[PDB]
Each structure stands twice: as C-alpha cells, then as structure tokens.
Amino acid sequence: HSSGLVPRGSHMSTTLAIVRLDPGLPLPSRAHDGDAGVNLYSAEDVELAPGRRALVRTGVAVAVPFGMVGLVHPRSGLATRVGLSIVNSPGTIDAGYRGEIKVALINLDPAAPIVVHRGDRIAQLLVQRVELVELVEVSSFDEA
Amino acid sequence: HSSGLVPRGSHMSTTLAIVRLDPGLPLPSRAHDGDAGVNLYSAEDVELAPGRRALVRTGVAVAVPFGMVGLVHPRSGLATRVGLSIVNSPGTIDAGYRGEIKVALINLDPAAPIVVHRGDRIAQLLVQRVELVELVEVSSFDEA
Amino acid sequence: HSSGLVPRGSHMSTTLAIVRLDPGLPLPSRAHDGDAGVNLYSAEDVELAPGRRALVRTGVAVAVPFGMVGLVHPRSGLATRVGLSIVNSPGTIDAGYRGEIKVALINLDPAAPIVVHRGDRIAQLLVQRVELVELVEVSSFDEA
Ligand SMILES: O=c1ccn([C@H]2C[C@H](O)[C@@H](COP(=O)(O)NP(=O)(O)OP(=O)(O)O)O2)c(=O)[nH]1
Ligand SMILES: O=c1ccn([C@H]2C[C@H](O)[C@@H](COP(=O)(O)NP(=O)(O)OP(=O)(O)O)O2)c(=O)[nH]1
Ligand SMILES: O=c1ccn([C@H]2C[C@H](O)[C@@H](COP(=O)(O)NP(=O)(O)OP(=O)(O)O)O2)c(=O)[nH]1
Ligand SMILES: [Mg+2]
Ligand SMILES: [Mg+2]
Ligand SMILES: [Mg+2]
Numbered sequence: 453h454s455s456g457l458v459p460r461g462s463h464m465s466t467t468l469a470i471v472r473l474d475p476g477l478p479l480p481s482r483a484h485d486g487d488a489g490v491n492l493y494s495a496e497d498v499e500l501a502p503g504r505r506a507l508v509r510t511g512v513a514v515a516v517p518f519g520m521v522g523l524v525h526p527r528s529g530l531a532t533r534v535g536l537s538i539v540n541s542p543g544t545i546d547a548g549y550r551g552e553i554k555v556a557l558i559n560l561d562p563a564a565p566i567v568v569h570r571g572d573r574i575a576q577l578l579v580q581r582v583e584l585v586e587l588v589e590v591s592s593f594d595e596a
Numbered sequence: 597h598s599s600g601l602v603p604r605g606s607h608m609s610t611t612l613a614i615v616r617l618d619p620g621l622p623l624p625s626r627a628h629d630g631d632a633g634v635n636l637y638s639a640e641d642v643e644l645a646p647g648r649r650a651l652v653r654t655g656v657a658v659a660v661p662f663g664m665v666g667l668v669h670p671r672s673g674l675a676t677r678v679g680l681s682i683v684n685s686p687g688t689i690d691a692g693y694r695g696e697i698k699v700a701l702i703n704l705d706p707a708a709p710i711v712v713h714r715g716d717r718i719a720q721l722l723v724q725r726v727e728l729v730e731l732v733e734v735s736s737f738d739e740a
Numbered sequence: 741h742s743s744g745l746v747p748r749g750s751h752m753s754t755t756l757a758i759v760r761l762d763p764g765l766p767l768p769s770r771a772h773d774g775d776a777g778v779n780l781y782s783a784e785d786v787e788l789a790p791g792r793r794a795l796v797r798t799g800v801a802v803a804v805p806f807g808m809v810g811l812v813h814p815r816s817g818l819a820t821r822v823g824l825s826i827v828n829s830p831g832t833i834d835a836g837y838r839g840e841i842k843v844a845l846i847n848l849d850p851a852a853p854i855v856v857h858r859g860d861r862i863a864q865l866l867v868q869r870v871e872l873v874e875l876v877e878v879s880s881f882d883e884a
Contacts, residue, residue, distance in 0.1 A: 465871065465873070466873050467875075470875050470877055471879070472877065487834045487835070488835070503704075528832065528844065531828035539676065540672045540676070541828075541830070542686055542829075544633060544669050544722070546631045547632070548629060558704060578809065578871075579873045580724065580868065581725070582722055583664065586609060586612070587612055587625075590614070590615055593615065651820050665866065683823060684815070687816060688813050688816065690772065690774060692775065700816065700820050702823075726776045726866055727753065727867040727868060728774065729756040729867045730753060732755045733758055733759070735759070
C-alpha cells in the first residue's frame with residue numbers, strides 16, 4: 453500500500469487546514485511517528501536579552517476545527533539549554549481564529565541572550581478536543 | 597428555534613456547575629463561538645511589581661466532571677502587552693475540587709508594574725477530558 | 741467487590757506502562773479520586789537560586805499510548821508558596837518516548853532559593869488524547 457491510503461486505525465484522524473503566509477518556510481511537521489505536536493518555525497530573526505519577550509511570527513495560519521483547540525507549547529530542548537519559554541504557555545488557538553500564529557517568546561535566562569533565526573523551530577502546535585461547556589449557575593453544589 | 601433548544605450537534609456537550617462566591621462579577625463567558633475557554637475575572641485589585649506574584653481570587657468555584665480536568669491558561673494579550681503570566685500554567689483544576697479558583701499571576705516584565713483591577717479578565721478556563729490512567733509497572737518496556 | 745475488578749464505568753480507562761529507573765521512589769500516584777495527574781518525584785537534591793533552572797530526574801520512564809500525550813504540569817502549591825515553575829510547561833511527553841522523564845524546574849522568585857529534596861513531589865503527569873492531525877495546505881481558507 454502507498455501513502456494516499458488512510459490506514460484503518462487512522463480512518464478517524466482529523467485534518468487541519470493551514471495557510472503558509474510565509475511560503476519560504478517548510479510546513480510544520482511531526483519529528484516522529486505519534487509525536488503530539490508539529491514544530492512551528494520562526495519567520496524572523498530576533499534577539500532576546502535576558503528577561504525580554506517578543507511576539508514572533510510563525511508564517512502560518514490554521515483553522516482549528518469547531519470542538520477543538522490548538523495549543524502552542526515550548527520546545528523542551530531550548531527550554532533547558534537556553535531558558536527559552538513562552539509567556540502565555542500554553543498558547544490557546546481558538547477554532548474561530550484565522551490570523552497568523554504568533555509565539556510570545558521570552559528569555560528566562562539571567563545573563564545570556566537568545567538568538568533566534570528565521571527557519572529555527574521555536575514551538576510546537578498540538579490539536580485537542582475541548583469541551584465547550586455550558587455553565588450551570590447554582591447557589592451551592594448540593595443544589596446541583 | 598429559540599435558545600433553550602439544544603441544537604443537534606451540541607446534544608452531547610457537557611455542563612459545568614459553577615458558584616459565584618462573588619456575585620458582583622459577571623459569569624465567565626466565551627468571547628466568541630467555538631472559543632476554547634471562558635474568561636475568568638479578578639475579584640480584586642492587585643499590583644504586581646516586576647518579578648512578583650500573587651494568588652488572585654476569581655470569585656468562582658466549579659465542579660469539573662469526573663473524567664475531566666479544568667485548565668487555567670494565561671490570556672495572550674496581557675502576556676504580550678505587559679508580561680503577565682501564570683506561575684503554575686496550565687493551572688490544573690481537579691474534578692474533586694470545590695474551592696474558589698485562584699490564579700497565581702506573576703509579572704515577567706523587567707521594569708513595569710502590572711495593575712489588575714477588580715472586574716478585569718485575567719485568565720481563561722478550559723475543560724477537557726483526561727485519561728485517569730491505571731499505572732502498570734514493568735521491569736522493561738519489552739516486557740509489556 | 742474487591743480491587744482487582746474493573747468497575748463498569750472504568751471499563752474503558754487506559755493503562756500506562758511505567759518503569760521505575762529509580763526503584764527507591766514510590767510510584768507516581770493520584771492524591772485523590774478523579775485527580776487529573778499523578779505526582780512525579782524528584783530523584784535528586786537540587787538547589788535553585790533565584791532565576792536559575794535545572795533539569796531534574798524523576799526516576800521514571802513511561803510509554804504513553806499512541807494517540808495520546810503525557811503532559812507535565814507544575815504543582816500549584818509550590819508555584820504560589822515559593823515561585824517554583826517549569827520552563828517548558830506544559831512539558832510534552834510523546835507516545836514514542838521511552839527515556840527518563842526529566843523536569844525543567846526554574847525558580848521564579850526574586851530573592852529566595854528553592855531547595856528540592858530527593859523524594860519531594862515536584863510536578864504532575866497527565867495523560868490525554870491528542871489529534872494526530874493531517875495538515876491540508878490551502879491557498880486561502882475560502883478554498884477549503
Ligand atoms: O518536560 C519534558 C518534556 C519532554 N521530555 C522528553 C519527552 C519528549 O517526547 C521528548 C522531546 O520533548 P520536546 O518535543 O518537548 N523537546 P524538543 O523539541 O527540544 O526535542 P525533540 O527534538 O526530541 O522533540 O523529551 C521530558 O522528559 N520532559
Ligand atoms: O500563542 C498564541 C495564542 C493565541 N493566538 C491567537 C489565537 C487565539 O484564538 C487568539 C486569542 O488568544 P487568547 O484568547 O489566548 N488572548 P486574549 O484573550 O488576550 O485575546 P482575545 O480577546 O482575542 O481572545 O490569539 C496566537 O497567535 N498565539
Ligand atoms: O491554577 C489553579 C490550580 C489549582 N487550583 C486548585 C484546584 C486544584 O484541584 C487544587 C490542587 O491543585 P494542584 O494539584 O495544581 N497543586 P498541589 O499539588 O500543590 O496541591 P494538592 O496537594 O491540593 O493537589 O488547587 C486553583 O484554584 N487554581
Ligand atoms: Mg519536539
Ligand atoms: Mg481570549
Ligand atoms: Mg496536586
């Protein structure tokens with residue numbers, strides 16, 4: 453069997469429409485089979501002094517399906533090696549959002565600046581279902 | 597059709613009981629259709645110097661259903677604009693928890709204090725299913 | 741009925757194989773019924789000055805099932821009390837990963853060092869399903 457056939461056990465897996473606003477970057481991909489996230493690239497060069505943060509363009513936009521959420525998580529390697537984090541982690545991408553995904557990077561190292569270059573992988577994007585809960589206000593939890 | 601009718605495609609959507617311990621705040625709501633989270637308010641005024649953190653009352657309590665988790669995520673706007681983050685993000689709200697949701701806000705800006713006023717939206721609350729996994733200890737992964 | 745019988749409503753609950761690389765630590769457990777996470781221990785003593793971070797061994801390895809993700813979240817108590825956080829939170833554990841779970845702890849307090857002792861609970865591990873999305877590149881979202 454070739455690629456185009458959806459294997460049985462992946463019949464149900466979901467699709468995510470994506471637009472490369474920056475066509476010069478590779479499409480986000482999973483580094484390994486079963487990996488939770490696809491790796492987002494930086495569209496830009498940016499240098500972050502200790503304690504500084506930046507809102508960095510990834511060059512993509514996505515259409516998260518209704519009933520789901522996209523989540524932007526930090527890469528573990530850079531987090532440890534150089535103290536790179538994401539201010540609003542986990543970044544919450546709503547089903548209705550059709551703008552460019554931007555990553556609020558922050559340098560949590562005390563002394564060493566972090567240089568990010570265009571084309572570097574700077575975060576990962578997961579997609580999960582979410583319960584769009586209906587609030588039921590009660591006067592006490594007994595009542596419910 | 598009017599509001600009270602549960603549309604077909606939302607027959608299965610879950611309910612979340614909530615108690616406004618602070619009845620003076622609006623109920624948390626989704627800013628847009630399909631948004632992953634409902635926006636939590638601060639019950640209080642608080643001022644956070646750079647690097648400082650506070651445990652801020654939201655004026656609500658919830659009953660996350662068994663088999664699910666509530667998750668407190670930072671708002672992207674404040675995160676970028678002013679460096680506001682959440683120390684324990686993502687905040688983990690257990691199914692059994694019936695206390696007030698409190699938000700561990702922290703100012704990650706190097707120089708500018710953040711002022712939060714009562715009634716400001718300071719986080720978002722998502723609800724997701726969680727696998728309540730049964731651990732199976734093995735001596736090596738082959739064995740399993 | 742005794743323990744070994746899987747109750748009806750937990751017929752479907754998933755298993756997580758785990759190896760204690762450090763057999764001297766307790767197995768991670770849920771502190772209460774319905775808790776989202778199991779509590780990870782530190783295998784080691786470590787002292788974190790303000791602003792410093794460390795990659796701390798938990799003494800376990802796990803096999804997250806294909807179609808799921810493990811997620812390492814900070815404990816709320818330590819986060820508030822002493823400013824302890826996790827640089828890459830939420831830590832993303834892929835289905836394929838068979839190495840030791842390590843926690844990138846960071847001291848976000850301005851002045852007081854944090855001492856972690858072997859055997860202390862330093863994070864929690866959740867397991868959730870994840871959508872292993874198939875990207876569909878489009879030239880505009882209309883097109884899709
Ligand atoms: O908190 C964590 C996160 C990850 N890990 C392990 C499990 C995970 O599958 C593996 C890779 O993690 P990330 O994808 O978060 N980091 P990065 O993208 O830098 O490394 P890789 O190229 O291996 O994916 O590291 C941990 O032990 N603790
Ligand atoms: O890391 C992120 C997070 C969000 N976003 C986009 C997608 C999301 O749907 C939109 C709104 O995000 P938040 O709800 O996290 N922030 P805030 O509540 O300040 O803005 P809004 O009023 O638009 O919801 O911003 C990103 O590009 N990157
Ligand atoms: O952001 C949060 C996180 C938790 N909480 C409440 C709900 C949760 O079920 C309870 C315990 O949270 P954690 O497990 O995250 N922290 P810790 O492990 O220190 O406390 P406990 O021993 O109670 O689990 O604290 C909040 O109000 N806000
Ligand atoms: Mg990775
Ligand atoms: Mg929002
Ligand atoms: Mg706990």
